[PDB]
Amino acid sequence: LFIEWL
Amino acid sequence: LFIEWL
Protein backbone atom coordinates (compact mmCIF):
# COMPACT_ATOMS: atom_id res chain seq x y z
CA LEU A 1 0.00 0.00 0.00
CA PHE A 2 1.49 3.33 -1.07
CA ILE A 3 -0.08 6.70 -0.19
CA GLU A 4 1.37 10.18 -0.81
CA TRP A 5 -0.07 13.63 -0.26
CA LEU A 6 1.81 16.76 -1.20
CA LEU B 1 -1.68 16.00 -4.94
CA PHE B 2 -2.90 12.59 -3.80
CA ILE B 3 -1.45 9.30 -4.98
CA GLU B 4 -2.62 5.83 -3.92
CA TRP B 5 -1.34 2.48 -5.08
CA LEU B 6 -2.84 -0.61 -3.52
Residue numbers in the entry:
A (entry chain B), B (entry chain A): 1 to 6
Published text:
Two polymorphic crystal forms could be grown from solutions of APRex-4. For example, protonated Glu forms H-bond either with the opposing Glu (S1 of polymorph A, S3 of Polymorph B in APRex-4 Fig. 6c), or with the indole rings of Trp(s) (S2 of Polymorph B Fig. 4e). Polymorphs formed in pure aqueous solution are laterally displaced, as the side chains of Tyr, Glu, and Gln rather form H-bonds with the surrounding water molecules. Aromatic side chains form intrasheet aromatic ladders in the two parallel structures of APRGLP2 and APRTc5b (polymorph D), as well as in both polymorphic structures of APRex-4. Interestingly, exendin-derived hexapeptides showed the greatest structural plasticity that is reflected in multiple β-sheeted conformers giving rise to several polymorphs.
We determine nine polymorphic crystal structures of the APR segments of glucagon-like peptides 1 and 2, and exendin and its derivatives.
